[PDB]
Design a protein around this ligand. Structure first.
Ligand SMILES: O=P(O)(O)O[C@H]1[C@@H](OP(=O)(O)O)[C@@H](OP(=O)(O)O)[C@@H](OP(=O)(O)O)[C@@H](OP(=O)(O)O)[C@H]1OP(=O)(O)O
Ligand SMILES: Nc1nc2c(ncn2[C@@H]2O[C@H](COP(=O)(O)OP(=O)(O)OP(=O)(O)O)[C@@H](O)[C@H]2O)c(=O)[nH]1
Ligand SMILES: [Mg+2]
Ligand SMILES: [Mg+2]
Ligand SMILES: [Zn+2]
Ligand SMILES: [Zn+2]
Ligand SMILES: [Zn+2]
Lengths: 49, 97, 98, 241, 73, 144, 144, 301, 96, 99
RNA sequence: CGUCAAAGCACUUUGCAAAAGCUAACGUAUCUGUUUCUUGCCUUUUACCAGAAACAGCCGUUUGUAAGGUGUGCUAAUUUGACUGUAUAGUUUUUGUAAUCU
């Protein structure tokens, strides 16, 4: 979803998780967008700790 | 609940459902208004007890009040220099000549 | 020899990366000292593996969260805990930085 | 990426990776040497890389636009080229006539040819310097380019012929102008253009397409000459001043 | 929403439960719920005097459970 | 002012398709092992020349016999000859395989190999087991 | 500006006003060729004249007779058939009949003042009612 | 005859005409502002150098007023606004809007009350935190200068009509006028105790009136000639000394005028390059401040 | 929530808590939950009257807690900003 | 598992050192290798089994055994910035969807 | 997405200022010149040959800020920032196992 350029579907799915991004964030390079999504979805690496 | 945030770091006295009173500094609150009080003193009817860091449950709390305030330009282009006044020989406004 | 200066220029030999003043963190340093001194909450371990399998990136993952000031570089990884110009040249860890 | 910053048209090399990588096998000696020389130039550029120094934004064109003696409008590029050629010719004529050198003829292709046999006095008086001759040759090259575009605009040649002619112009400045005489460090750029031609040719004429005119991939040579002009502009302005 | 209490280590062990109103029940823990409702088997009740009555299988509401205690070393 | 651009995914894909003759096909960066900039700087400093790369001026002409002595250090008498020390070694490990190592530059040692192969035909799904990949069968193990 | 036979077809409301624009272009050419009878700046006055007239024609098409669609009008401004800045000046009070845009800006004057044409004739003496040197204007002020 | 290092000190700064420069109530600091949309803070004693600039105002500083706390500054802008500048940190505290024209004058109260007039023929009183005009008074002709009594119920507003209006905030009864002037009142200033009003008008006469509930008719005390106003219709200021026995004024004839409050001219000293907008006296020593529309401000005795 | 975060921080230390009975418990906290159910070790129970008993392992239900006396050196524990969806106060690096 | 990983495992088990396994660069299975989810699971399982074999070559004790159900193995992609376990991701389900 | 706050906003012209601090692309590009050395070809100078060091110039880039222009608005539009941001009377906190006396 992050990679394949599906702004509306990804936005809706993140809204279901109460993860809210600024509109300029969906227009990012693929890798920083992946990092942003993964940092909002999986926060601090608490599993490793 | 925005006003409740304004009470952070203030000194608070909290009356409890038991009837006691805890006085101390607020560190963090909760949605159920669980309170975290630092350097807490106990008011049991008055008797003094040091408690320290104390977490009050939401149910235990009845009322709360504050007792103290919370513990607490670059440059410009101006340059001065002495000078005197130079008397002109004219007496007229600037516009009129 | 003509190469030797008459007045030696002021040279400061910097070898590693080092911040002049302690950067801010998400926690307080006194809190960390309290955990180290008066708590059983301390864990000592090493991060080991094969070459370029990502063990420095694992620590960069924690550094990004605890140190809000640090930002990812432009063309490579942060590679925190390298702190040697030689290692930044070869883009690989050579010393065990704690 | 999916997001960028719109580099300038001449800041895109388009064939740099061709010689940054290894040379293809089974190539003639000149192609291999061209690959090696271009790689050498790139390495020398990268070695003396200087971190840019801080400076406030200044630009000649904005300063000139601020004055009341300069105006602005939008015109066709070919019209602007014709205007520049005509203005340069008029300027060169006015300096050859405020010297009394009225017996010298500056033809429309920018050749200084006397109209009569000159005595020793006239010959010594009518000797110009490297600044005038260098500027005259640069003007001649500019007129060559604008005349090619004018020919294309008239319908005398089509687009493919125009592109081939422009590629030939940029690859053969040393044979079409004679500008190298008054500033011999142009030979670097001439060598660079020859090297670029070899690469493009031996990557262009492969298979069904063979030997002959037609290769009009003129971007690399064009940007080579642009980068020569970038450096020669301040020197010429100082000399002409 | 809610959360399951951690009582897996307390399963099938002799336990002491303190209810509200100074009650007290023995037994072996056999199950628990989200609201800490607990299930006891072959349990024994204490009275204020101190004599123990066999009380049997017990299904305590989690609202009234004060503490849950094990005694083993 | 035309200073920043943002393109869709179909637009970027189509532009990548159209200009397919003028862009590299490496995506690995391990291809340039001894043929990248830092290796060229080291070669220029040492005056050696990889036979596919550029040739410069020595940058250090001070090699006259001012000492007039062989120093009895590099002599054949006390040296084991196994394989000749090629210049690829002197460029790969500049600080070990040659003395007088000044102005050399060090290069990235290694990069994780890229294992992406582009799809041949769009009809196949994006996620598909490529037959080139060896099957995962390792019944040679002694676990607990 | 110049349109080819294979260019994108202008909006629908263009062809019925195409001939008069052609006439404007024709006379602009004639003015270019026509030489003599003036000083260095007076011979360049009729250019602004026709230019203002042409822009006013387009302005009249839109804002006074609504004879052209908004799409065509934006197209005309984008194709430089009209001066957008001059029309913008015409749309604000005090500049309804502005001659050109060089007679309003004060950085092109000796004493940082607008032109004589911008001044109402009621406060101007009878003798100094002269032709503008910038464009030959004979009174811009909205009152006149 | 003071603690100044030099008897006369020229202050250089600003990029346009300076319109106001007011002393701190403590008499230790002062600020200046003008057509350059900037406020400069100064030090009265010592090296007399700037310690801060107040950037962010989107218009000329028509007037400004120090606070009694000497910690916040209120500035009136020509762009129909009224900003509150924190002097010790320099950030935007609040921006009071509601006018409909150039805000000409400003005054502060002994209580955090601000008052102002503008060309929209209105007067507005502002609380320091309300961000809105709690009271508004509408007139027929634009108002030019204000004076608030330190007690806090009477305000004197001078405008085009040439007659000072006295408004009681609570009473809203206005049938008491200080007639006597015949042209535009440039500035008003209240005496330290609150008994006398200093008026300057474009009819070329600087007059003095008494501020008391009771009078023996002809409330006009005396008039002073000489202070002439030019054709630029500037807003020339007047000042009250710390002892309220020397009244000061500026004139467009390049003259600073000090009178003895008894009709005898005392100072005629020239020294300005343009029309002198503002004049002020130090509340402790015998310093006089000058502020002219020539990018310069003069020190005094 | 920050309060339950501090309660979790306390695990492994010695914490004193009193329930709705009035008895105070002195022992080592070993587990805690969002409901504030607590597991304890080596408890020294002081009754309301004053009688002192001892316990070894207890599982106190959270709903019967008045307050706790957390060890003092947890005063410097970090209070992280909590977003809308996050259920545990942790350092953040994304948008919020 | 490579040669240095084998050496580290041997020396750690030889010195009675608990081992926590972090399977890094998981995102390369999705974006580079483009494996389907089932084959990705098989690859992860094979890597874990190789680590367990390298452990068993020294001491067959069950104390040193790495496997996700023991909470001893973390799946990570340090470039994309995530490192989860079975229990961590499970909790991330539980907080959303109840008790 | 929601709340709060202040800022008209989008696009654009010009001026001023700054641009490595923790080893790192102000520019994923790439020219010219001067001085001091060492070379190449050389009958002498310019013009040159190709390496180094120290310096500059030019073609460009980014950010902050100030004053304007165009198009739309202030009878609303957009942008920026901050936020401990959400339900719920049925056991784990907020729709009472309370009163009664001691
Ligand atoms: O000068 P070179 O690079 O050696 O190239 C020359 C020739 O150039 P000149 O006309 O200047 O001699 C042609 O090149 P263009 O003139 O077309 O640039 C021609 O090229 P085509 O045959 O591709 O037209 C051909 O180059 P090649 O034979 O490599 O294609 C030929 O080379 P030779 O000198 O070896 O004959
Ligand atoms: N795709 C991808 N690349 C990663 C990931 N983690 C690390 N890398 C890359 O792995 C390479 C090496 O990263 P390092 O952190 O230096 O690995 P390392 O183990 O510290 O290297 P050594 O210290 O020399 O052993 C870099 O290219 C990183 O960008 C990941 O999760 N996904
Ligand atoms: Mg490492
Ligand atoms: Mg000679
Ligand atoms: Zn006119
Ligand atoms: Zn005009
Ligand atoms: Zn005019």
């Amino acid at each position: 979803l992050t990679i394949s350029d599906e702004a509306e579907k990804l936005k809706k799915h993140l809204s279901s998780f109460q993860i809210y991004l600024k509109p300029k964030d969906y227009l990012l390079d693929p890798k920083p967008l992946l990092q942003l999504i993964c940092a909002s979805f999986f926060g601090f690496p608490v599993g490793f700790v | 609940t925005t006003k409740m945030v304004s009470l952070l770091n203030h000194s608070l006295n909290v009356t409890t459902k038991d009837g006691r009173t805890f006085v101390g500094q607020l560190l963090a609150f909760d949605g159920f208004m669980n309170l975290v009080l630092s350097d807490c003193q106990e008011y049991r009817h008055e008797e003094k007890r040091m408690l320290g860091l104390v977490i009050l449950r939401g149910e235990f709390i009845v009322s709360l009040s504050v007792q103290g305030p919370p513990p607490m330009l670059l440059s410009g282009p101006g340059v001065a220099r002495p000078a005197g006044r130079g008397i002109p020989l004219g007496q007229a406004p600037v516009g009129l000549a | 020899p003509l190469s030797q200066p008459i007045i030696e220029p002021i040279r400061h030999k910097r070898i590693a990366i080092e911040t002049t003043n302690v950067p801010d963190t998400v926690y307080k340093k006194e809190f960390l000292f309290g955990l180290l001194t008066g708590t059983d909450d301390v864990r000592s371990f090493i991060v080991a593996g094969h070459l370029h399998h990502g063990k420095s990136a694992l620590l960069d993952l924690l550094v990004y969260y605890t140190h809000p000031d640090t930002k990812p570089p432009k063309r490579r990884s942060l590679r925190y805990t390298d702190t040697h110009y030689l290692e930044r040249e070869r883009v690989m860890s050579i010393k065990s930085t704690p | 990426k999916r997001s960028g910053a719109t580099k300038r048209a001449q800041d895109v090399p388009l064939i740099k990776h061709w010689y940054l990588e290894h040379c293809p096998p089974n190539q003639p000696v000149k192609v291999r040497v061209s690959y090696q020389k271009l790689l050498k130039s790139h390495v020398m550029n990268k070695l003396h890389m200087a971190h840019p120094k801080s400076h406030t934004n200044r630009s000649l064109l904005r300063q000139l636009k601020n004055t009341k003696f300069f105006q602005s409008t939008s015109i066709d590029w070919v019209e602007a080229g014709l205007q520049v050629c005509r203005q340069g010719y008029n300027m060169l004529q006015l300096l050859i006539h405020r010297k009394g050198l009225t017996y010298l003829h500056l033809d429309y292709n920018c050749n200084l040819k006397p109209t009569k046999t000159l005595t020793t006095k006239e010959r010594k008086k009518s000797r110009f310097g490297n600044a005038f001759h260098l500027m005259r040759e640069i003007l001649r090259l500019t007129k060559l380019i604008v005349d090619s575009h004018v020919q294309y605009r008239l319908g005398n040649i089509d687009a493919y012929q125009l592109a081939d002619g422009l590629h030939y112009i940029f690859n053969h400045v040393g044979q079409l102008t004679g500008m190298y005489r008054y500033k011999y460090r142009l030979m670097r750029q001439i060598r660079a253009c020859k090297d670029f031609k070899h690469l493009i040719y031996y990557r262009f004429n492969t298979g069904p397409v063979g030997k002959g005119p037609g290769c009009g991939f003129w971007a690399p040579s064009w940007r080579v000459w642009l980068f020569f002009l970038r450096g020669i502009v301040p020197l010429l302005e100082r000399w002409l001043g | 929403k809610a959360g399951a209490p951690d009582l897996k280590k307390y399963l099938d062990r002799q336990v002491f439960v303190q209810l509200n109103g100074s009650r007290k029940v023995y037994g072996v823990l056999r199950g628990y719920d989200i609201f800490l409702n607990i299930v006891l088997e072959d349990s024994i009740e204490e009275k204020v005097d101190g004599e123990k009555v066999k009380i049997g299988s017990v299904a305590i509401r989690g609202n009234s459970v004060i503490m849950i205690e094990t005694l083993d070393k | 002012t035309y200073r920043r651009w943002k393109l869709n995914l179909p637009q970027m894909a189509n532009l990548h398709r159209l200009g397919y003759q003028l862009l590299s096909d490496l995506r690995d960066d391990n291809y340039f092992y001894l043929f990248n900039d830092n290796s060229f700087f080291t070669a220029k400093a040492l005056n050696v020349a990889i036979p596919g790369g550029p040739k410069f001026e020595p940058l250090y002409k001070d090699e006259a016999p001012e000492m007039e002595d062989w120093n009895e250090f590099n002599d054949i008498y006390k040296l084991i000859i196994r394989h000749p020390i090629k210049t690829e070694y002197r460029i790969a490990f500049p600080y070990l395989y040659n003395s007088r190592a000044r102005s050399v530059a060090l290069s990235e040692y290694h990069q994780p190999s890229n294992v992406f192969v582009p799809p041949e035909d769009p009809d196949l799904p994006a996620f598909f087991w490529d037959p080139i990949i060896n099957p995962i069968t390792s019944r040679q193990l002694t676990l607990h | 500006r110049l349109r080819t036979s294979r260019t994108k077809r202008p909006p629908d409301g263009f062809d019925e006003i195409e001939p008069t624009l052609i006439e404007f272009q024709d006379r602009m050419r004639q003015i270019e060729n026509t030489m003599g009878k003036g000083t260095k700046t007076e011979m360049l006055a009729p250019i602004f004249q026709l230019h203002h007239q042409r822009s006013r024609y387009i302005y009249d098409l839109y804002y006074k007779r609504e004879a052209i669609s908004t799409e065509l009008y934006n197209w005309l401004l984008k194709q430089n058939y009209a001066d957008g800045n001059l029309i913008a000046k015409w749309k604000k009070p005090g500049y309804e009949k502005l001659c050109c845009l060089r007679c309003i800006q004060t950085a092109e004057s000796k004493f940082g003042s607008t032109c004589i044409c911008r001044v109402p004739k009621s406060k101007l003496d009878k003798d100094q009612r002269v032709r503008c040197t910038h464009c030959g204007c004979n009174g811009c002020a909205s009152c006149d | 005859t003071s603690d100044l290092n030099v008897p006369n000190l020229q202050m250089f700064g600003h990029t346009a005409e300076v319109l106001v420069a007011r002393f701190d109530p403590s008499g230790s600091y002062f600020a200046s502002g003008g057509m350059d949309r900037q406020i400069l803070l100064w030090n009265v004693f010592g090296d007399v150098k700037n310690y801060g600039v107040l950037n962010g105002c989107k218009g000329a500083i028509t007037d400004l007023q120090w606070s009694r706390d000497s910690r916040v500054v209120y500035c009136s802008s020509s762009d129909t606004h009224l900003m509150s500048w924190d002097a010790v940190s320099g950030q935007k505290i609040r921006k009071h809007k509601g006018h409909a024209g150039v805000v000409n004058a400003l005054d502060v109260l002994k209580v955090e009350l601000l008052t102002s007039v503008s060309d929209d023929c209105t007067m507005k009183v502002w609380d320091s935190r309300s961000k809105d005009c709690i009271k508004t008074i509408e007139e027929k002709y634009p108002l030019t200068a204000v004076a608030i009594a330190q007690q806090g119920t009477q305000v004197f507003i001078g405008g085009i009509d040439g007659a000072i209006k006295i408004w009681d905030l609570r009473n809203n009864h206005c049938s008491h006028v200080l007639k006597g002037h015949k042209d535009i009142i440039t500035s008003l200033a209240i005496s330290k105790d609150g008994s006398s009003l200093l008026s300057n008008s474009m009819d070329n006469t600087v007059r003095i009136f008494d501020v008391k509930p009771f009078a023996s008719a002809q409330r006009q005390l005396q008039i002073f000639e000489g202070a002439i106003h030019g054709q630029e219709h500037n807003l020339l200021g007047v000042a009250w000394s710390r002892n309220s026995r020397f009244v000061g004024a500026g004139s467009s004839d390049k003259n600073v005028y000090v009178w003895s409050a008894t009709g005898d001219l005392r100072y005629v000293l020239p020294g300005h390059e343009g029309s002198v907008n503002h004049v002020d006296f130090h509340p402790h020593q015998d310093i006089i401040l000058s502020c002219s529309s020539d990018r310069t401000i003069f020190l005094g005795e | 929530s920050l309060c339950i975060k501090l309660l979790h921080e306390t695990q492994g230390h010695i914490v004193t808590m009193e329930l709705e009975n009035g008895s105070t418990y002195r022992g080592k906290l070993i587990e805690a939950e969002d409901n504030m159910n607590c597991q304890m070790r080596d408890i020294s129970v002081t009754a309301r009257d004053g009688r002192v008993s001892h316990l070894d392992q207890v599982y106190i239900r959270g709903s019967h807690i008045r307050f706790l006396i957390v060890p003092d050196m947890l005063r410097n524990a970090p209070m992280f900003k909590v977003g809308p969806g996050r259920s545990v106060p942790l350092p953040t690096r994304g948008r919020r | 598992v490579m040669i240095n990983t084998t050496r580290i495992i041997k020396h750690a088990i030889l010195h009675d050192m608990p081992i926590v396994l972090v399977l890094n660069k998981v995102d390369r299975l999705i974006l580079e290798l483009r494996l389907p989810p089932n084959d990705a699971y098989h690859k992860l399982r094979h890597v874990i089994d190789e680590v367990n074999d390298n452990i068993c070559q020294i001491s067959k004790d069950l104390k040193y055994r790495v496997s996700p159900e023991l909470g001893n193995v973390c799946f990570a992609s340090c470039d994309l910035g995530y490192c989860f376990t079975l229990s961590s991701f499970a909790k991330l389900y539980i907080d959303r969807h109840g008790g």
